[PDB]
């Protein structure tokens, strides 16, 4: 029943600020300490700052101090996280911990926001090709490729289809990622049904649900 | 401000007792650096185990304790679930802040699958082409996935990710060679090849 949740990854351009959200529940909002971390890519955490929700006492690190800026909304039970002058040395995943006192902190963490300081993906059906059954069972996938940034929304048959659906970690390659995902239906299935494989791309608005056809 | 050091990956069977130590740049850890223990699991989940030196933390397995040894501190697992295989960072509070270490990546059998895909028409339509083969059912997610075209080996073009352990206690992953859609009319075979654990395993497609 504890729970603190982040905002969604974000995109920003350089020169440019990021107010990243932490709700939290299951607790009392002001008698617990906010603190937030980041970790740049091949880095370690990085300490920022931390929040008294209560007190509304924020507590910077020297070098941080004048570009980090917590504010709490007591009604709400949300810490935000102003990020201003944002370079690409910025780009990490933040997260956001509770604590109490040095003996007793950072025991729940949020899932962590990223921050990446746009093109969207271009999706290709791939049927069988060995028309030859493996077995009783046939497996499509979906080629995502070269979008960006991070990340996208593989879905088969708009959620219908979740048993055996394998979405893979993307690859890295100039910039733009690919990344793919398989579904194994069993092969009765198809294709005398219609199997679509549905992918967001939040950061450019898109959507595409392409129709798998042999 | 000092520098948290940890040994980068300690390996151990389950039900042995591994000891994760850290120490500073600063001198001794005493007390008053109140020592967090942080156990991170991928896609960057953290829990927190121990705090201020050898404090459980709220509903955590007894085996996890924390102490002093000597001038360092100690992350002591008795009893390793295979659970228990993650990541473990030190905190050391370096008053007005903490300082973390970089990790301890503690690790406490399966041949893997080949599936290879032939490139998309519309993508072909492009003058691309991208083979996919997705390794599946490999245990421990370790292994080298190499190309051959007409028995030759290639080594530009390949792209492999990084093995995802599926919530079965098993890997995965994705090659992908990209070539042309004239290279790809050009040959005869295409062979994704896998080593894992001393012996291969190779899947091939025309």
């Known amino acids: 029943e504890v729970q603190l949740q982040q905002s969604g990854a974000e995109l920003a351009r350089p020169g440019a600020s990021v107010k990243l959200s932490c709700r939290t529940s299951?607790?009392?909002?002001?008698?617990?300490?906010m603190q937030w971390v980041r970790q740049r890519p091949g880095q370690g955490l990085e300490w920022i700052a931390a929040?008294?929700?209560?007190?509304?006492?924020?507590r910077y690190t020297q070098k941080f101090k004048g570009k980090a800026t917590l504010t709490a909304d007591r009604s709400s039970s949300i810490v935000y996280l102003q990020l201003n002058s944002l370079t690409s040395e910025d780009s990490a995943v933040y997260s956001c911990?509770?604590?109490?006192?040095?003996?007793?902190?950072?025991?729940?963490w949020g899932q962590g926001t990223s921050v990446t300081v746009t093109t969207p993906p271009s999706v290709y059906p791939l049927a069988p090709g060995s028309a030859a059954q493996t077995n009783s069972m046939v497996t499509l996938g979906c080629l995502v490729k070269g979008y960006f940034p991070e990340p996208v929304t593989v879905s088969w048959n708009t959620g219908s289809l979740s048993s055996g659906v394998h979405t893979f970690p993307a690859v890295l390659q100039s910039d733009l990622y690919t990344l793919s995902s398989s579904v194994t239906v069993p092969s009765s299935t198809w294709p005398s049904e219609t199997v679509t494989c549905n992918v967001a791309h939040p950061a450019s608005s898109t959507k595409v649900d392409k129709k798998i056809v042999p | 401000q000092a520098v948290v050091t940890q040994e980068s990956a300690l390996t151990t069977s389950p039900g042995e007792t591994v000891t994760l130590t850290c120490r500073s740049s600063?001198?001794?850890?005493?007390?008053?650096?109140?020592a967090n223990w942080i156990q991170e699991k991928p896609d960057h989940l953290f829990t927190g185990l121990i705090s201020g030196t050898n404090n459980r933390a709220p509903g955590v397995p007894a085996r996890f304790s924390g102490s002093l040894i000597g001038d360092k501190a100690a992350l002591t697992i008795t009893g390793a679930q295979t659970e228990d295989e993650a990541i473990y960072i030190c905190?050391?509070?370096?008053?007005?802040?903490?300082?973390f270490g970089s990790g301890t990546k503690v690790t406490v059998k399966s041949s893997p699958s080949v599936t290879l895909f032939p490139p998309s028409s519309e993508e072909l339509e492009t003058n691309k082409a991208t083979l996919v083969c997705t390794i599946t059912d490999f245990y421990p997610g370790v292994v080298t996935v190499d190309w051959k075209v007409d028995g030759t080996p290639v080594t530009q073009g390949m792209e492999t990710t990084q093995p995802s352990k599926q919530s079965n206690n098993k890997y995965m992953a994705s090659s992908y060679l990209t070539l042309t859609a004239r290279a790809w009319e050009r040959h005869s075979s295409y062979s994704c090849q896998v080593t894992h654990e001393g012996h291969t395993v190779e899947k091939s497609l025309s």
């Open positions: 911990s509770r604590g109490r006192s040095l003996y007793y902190t950072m025991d729940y």
């Open positions: 905190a050391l509070w370096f008053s007005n802040q903490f300082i």
């Open positions: 600063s001198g001794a850890i005493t007390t008053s650096h109140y």
């Open positions: 929040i008294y929700p209560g007190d509304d006492d924020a």
């Open positions: 299951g607790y009392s909002f002001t008698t617990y300490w």
